[PDB]
Amino acid sequence: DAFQLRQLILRGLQD
Amino acid sequence: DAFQLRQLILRGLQD
Amino acid sequence: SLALSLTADQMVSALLDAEPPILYSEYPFSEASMMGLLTNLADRELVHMINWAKRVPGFVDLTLHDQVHLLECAWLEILMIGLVWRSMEHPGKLLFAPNLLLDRNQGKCVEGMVEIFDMLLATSSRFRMMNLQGEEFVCLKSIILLNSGVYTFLSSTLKSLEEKDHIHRVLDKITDTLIHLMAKAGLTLQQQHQRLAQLLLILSHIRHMSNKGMEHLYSMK
Amino acid sequence: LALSLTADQMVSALLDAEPPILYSEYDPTRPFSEASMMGLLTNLADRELVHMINWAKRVPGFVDLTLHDQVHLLECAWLEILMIGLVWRSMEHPGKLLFAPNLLLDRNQGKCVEGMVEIFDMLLATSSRFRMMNLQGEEFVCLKSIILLNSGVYTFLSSTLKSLEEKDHIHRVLDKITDTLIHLMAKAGLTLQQQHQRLAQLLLILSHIRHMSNKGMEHLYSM
Ligand SMILES: O=C(c1ccc(OCCN2CCCCC2)cc1)c1c(-c2ccc(O)cc2)sc2cc(O)ccc12
Ligand SMILES: O=C(c1ccc(OCCN2CCCCC2)cc1)c1c(-c2ccc(O)cc2)sc2cc(O)ccc12
């Protein structure tokens, strides 16, 4: 959940 | 380690 | 720059309108089920926090890399300030959700959790004693987002210079807004500067709670 | 005594309270000898701590608290206080940390200890930020006392009457230090707007210092 945080943040921002 | 800090502070505040 | 053109009233409106929805929990405890319920809630709030960040003036002017970094540094602080705000009218209790209201004895259900519960309760008390207003809350929550990662970008790079300058200018706008609320409410200049200081000093306590929290969370993994 | 001070008096009290600037044991005329970075930094931190305690007693308000709370404040704040002192004396040395006047270390000396460079960079970024703001000595001494008084205030007991009185007293002294900061800014020419803005800027840096201190403890404990 250190990698899964950044992806979760990434997806929310570009969409 | 955490004891050594409390000791130091208690010494300094008292005399 | 839309963000730097806003009046205080406009900033407050933008921030009030940006607010994410108040989420309900899925709610006989254990360490696992309570952490299960709190984890579920944190993760669902995080999805809404991201959308909220995009609505904070200034935020989307930054690069994607820095937008990510700010949320990565701030997310637990933001969860915590939300908790502490909605817990204000429930002394002795933390209102994780309207259907999930916990006291310090349920904190003890999870090893190492009570210390942080007590800190969160002490912060909620402090807001109660100060009559923290909703308008002030939304300003503080944006300060946290914009401030917590700003010192740990790269440095001596031209791009970072431009990014930090922009954040500092937006933070100055949010300060002006806070003073404006206080002046509108009747406070003397002296009382204005004093309350502002009091509110911002509480932010370093929230930083501390977040760091202690990450430390506690990581140690369950 | 503390609540009766004028701004000028508070500043004087704080300037006068300052601890000595300490020298490292490093001998620059023996550069090719085996020297231990952590050994030298530890020796310095421990000697500063002895002086920090005596400094705390000279901060207005501090000795009015109970002994238990005096201990607690220093226990929560000591690394923040070491760090803000480092950062202050490093302001006129961009790219370097002035741990002592005879121990001026380049950024890259961070790499000598595993996990130390991240914190060095954070310290350097803070020193930069003070430089960019032209932080004044008067402002620095105010900030250092705020750290002492504010860092442990939230984590006493709570719902006990004694803590209520202790916190009330701290909050009143903190209010006095804020008044003092604003006074320095007003005296220096800033508009009201500029005063509130700079005050906010300074206090927001304090939460970065808290963060560095927490990262520091985490790094120290792991050695
Ligand atoms: O219990 C939690 C909590 C539980 C799980 C979390 O994270 C799960 C990991 N997840 C992985 C994907 C990225 C986002 C986090 C975060 C907070 C909350 C908090 C906490 C309190 C004390 C403590 O020692 C640690 C945390 S504070 C909080 C506020 C909320 O609004 C919701 C949950 C919470
Ligand atoms: O190098 C040190 C340092 C070394 C040892 C310390 O503590 C040793 C244990 N000692 C035991 C008795 C209680 C007090 C601490 C503290 C700081 C300094 C710092 C540091 C930087 C990064 C990091 O990850 C950790 C620390 S900052 C600092 C400022 C100073 O003025 C002096 C030393 C220092």
Side-chain angles (χ1 to χ4, degrees), chain A residues 2-3 5-10 12-15, chain B residues 2 5-6 8-10 12-14, chain C residues 1 3-26 28-110 112-150 152-153 155 157-172 174-183 185-220, chain D residues 1-33 35-113 115-117 119-153 155-156 160-186 188-223:
Chain A
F3 154 102
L5 170 60
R6 184 176 286 158
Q7 291 274 293
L8 216 69
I9 289 164
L10 224 89
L13 285 170
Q14 288 175 304
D15 219 60
Chain B
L5 175 59
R6 194 167 292 182
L8 279 198
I9 297 157
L10 213 32
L13 293 164
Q14 289 185 118
Chain C
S1 169
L4 301 183
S5 62
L6 292 186
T7 64
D9 287 350
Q10 284 169 336
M11 177 64 82
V12 158
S13 280
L15 295 181
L16 283 177
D17 285 18
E19 278 292 273
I22 303 274
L23 295 194
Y24 280 65
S25 176
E26 340 233 311
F29 286 121
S30 91
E31 177 156 16
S33 82
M34 193 183 289
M35 278 316 300
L37 286 180
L38 297 176
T39 292
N40 168 268
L41 188 63
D43 289 347
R44 284 161 52 219
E45 291 192 79
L46 181 61
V47 173
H48 295 294
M49 182 190 298
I50 293 162
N51 298 336
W52 155 88
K54 292 197 285 188
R55 305 189 285 245
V56 169
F59 189 75
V60 299
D61 302 331
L62 306 164
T63 62
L64 186 61
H65 179 105
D66 297 330
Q67 283 172 45
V68 170
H69 183 77
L70 289 187
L71 280 160
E72 202 170 272
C73 287
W75 65 275
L76 190 52
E77 291 184 28
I78 289 154
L79 286 183
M80 281 178 172
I81 204 190
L83 175 64
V84 154
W85 161 256
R86 53 189 190 267
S87 295
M88 266 182 83
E89 314 309 345
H90 298 280
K93 304 202 190 288
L94 289 180
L95 184 154
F96 286 94
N99 66 341
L100 185 55
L101 182 67
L102 297 186
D103 63 37
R104 86 180 286 279
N105 292 274
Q106 295 159 299
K108 295 180 175 180
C109 283
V110 184
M113 186 148 226
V114 78
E115 296 81 17
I116 320 287
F117 255 53
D118 286 345
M119 292 189 269
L120 292 157
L121 291 165
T123 312
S124 198
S125 267
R126 184 82 179 116
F127 285 163
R128 217 202 332 293
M129 304 292 288
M130 289 186 79
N131 300 325
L132 186 66
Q133 301 291 296
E135 293 86 353
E136 298 172 304
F137 168 72
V138 295
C139 293
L140 295 178
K141 190 165 57 161
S142 286
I143 287 171
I144 289 166
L145 177 66
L146 298 173
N147 188 50
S148 296
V150 65
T152 45
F153 301 139
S155 266
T157 219
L158 297 184
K159 190 68 195 166
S160 58
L161 173 72
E162 306 290 0
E163 280 333 63
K164 287 161 166 160
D165 188 74
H166 189 64
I167 290 156
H168 291 145
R169 294 203 71 92
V170 182
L171 290 169
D172 292 341
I174 301 168
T175 299
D176 294 348
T177 299
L178 278 172
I179 291 297
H180 182 78
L181 294 164
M182 295 173 196
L187 312 191
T188 62
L189 288 168
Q190 187 189 30
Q191 287 161 2
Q192 283 164 51
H193 63 232
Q194 279 180 13
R195 185 177 179 80
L196 181 62
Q198 284 157 3
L199 292 176
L200 301 175
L201 286 175
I202 289 168
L203 291 196
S204 66
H205 293 174
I206 291 168
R207 178 74 77 117
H208 183 70
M209 292 191 290
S210 177
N211 294 357
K212 245 50 215 221
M214 288 307 294
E215 192 156 6
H216 177 231
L217 288 170
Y218 178 103
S219 72
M220 294 175 313
Chain D
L1 180 138
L3 301 181
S4 63
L5 293 185
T6 63
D8 286 354
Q9 285 169 337
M10 177 65 78
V11 159
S12 281
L14 295 182
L15 284 177
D16 286 15
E18 279 292 271
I21 307 275
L22 296 199
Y23 280 63
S24 166
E25 323 219 321
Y26 188 71
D27 179 359
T29 76
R30 309 188 165 194
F32 301 121
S33 284
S36 172
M37 187 168 160
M38 279 318 295
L40 290 175
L41 297 181
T42 292
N43 177 262
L44 192 62
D46 293 351
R47 287 159 50 219
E48 290 194 77
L49 180 62
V50 177
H51 292 294
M52 179 193 302
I53 293 165
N54 300 333
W55 158 87
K57 295 198 287 190
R58 307 190 285 246
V59 171
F62 190 74
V63 300
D64 303 329
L65 304 162
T66 63
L67 188 55
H68 178 108
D69 295 331
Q70 285 173 47
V71 167
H72 182 78
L73 288 185
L74 279 158
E75 201 172 272
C76 288
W78 67 273
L79 191 50
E80 290 182 309
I81 290 155
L82 283 184
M83 282 176 174
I84 201 193
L86 175 59
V87 157
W88 163 256
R89 53 192 189 265
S90 293
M91 265 178 84
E92 309 318 344
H93 297 282
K96 305 202 188 287
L97 291 174
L98 186 150
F99 285 94
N102 63 344
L103 201 53
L104 182 59
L105 301 184
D106 184 72
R107 192 258 178 200
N108 100 128
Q109 298 298 83
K111 299 178 187 178
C112 296
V113 187
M116 187 148 223
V117 85
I119 319 287
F120 255 52
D121 288 345
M122 292 185 260
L123 291 156
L124 293 163
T126 315
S127 201
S128 270
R129 185 84 179 115
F130 287 161
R131 216 201 335 290
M132 304 288 289
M133 288 185 80
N134 301 324
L135 185 67
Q136 300 294 294
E138 294 85 355
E139 295 174 305
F140 165 73
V141 297
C142 290
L143 291 178
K144 190 166 58 158
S145 284
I146 288 166
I147 289 163
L148 176 66
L149 294 175
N150 186 234
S151 298
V153 65
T155 47
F156 300 140
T160 216
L161 309 185
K162 191 69 199 174
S163 56
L164 175 70
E165 307 287 0
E166 277 339 74
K167 285 162 167 163
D168 189 77
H169 189 63
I170 290 160
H171 290 144
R172 296 203 71 91
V173 182
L174 290 167
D175 291 337
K176 248 284 155 53
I177 300 167
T178 298
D179 292 348
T180 302
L181 277 170
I182 290 294
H183 181 77
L184 295 163
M185 296 172 195
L190 313 190
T191 61
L192 289 165
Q193 186 186 30
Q194 287 158 0
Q195 282 163 51
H196 64 232
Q197 280 178 11
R198 185 177 178 80
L199 181 64
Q201 283 160 3
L202 291 180
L203 303 173
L204 288 172
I205 292 166
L206 297 190
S207 63
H208 295 174
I209 290 166
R210 178 76 78 116
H211 183 72
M212 291 192 287
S213 176
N214 289 112
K215 246 48 215 219
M217 286 306 290
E218 191 157 12
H219 176 232
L220 289 171
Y221 178 104
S222 70
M223 295 171 320

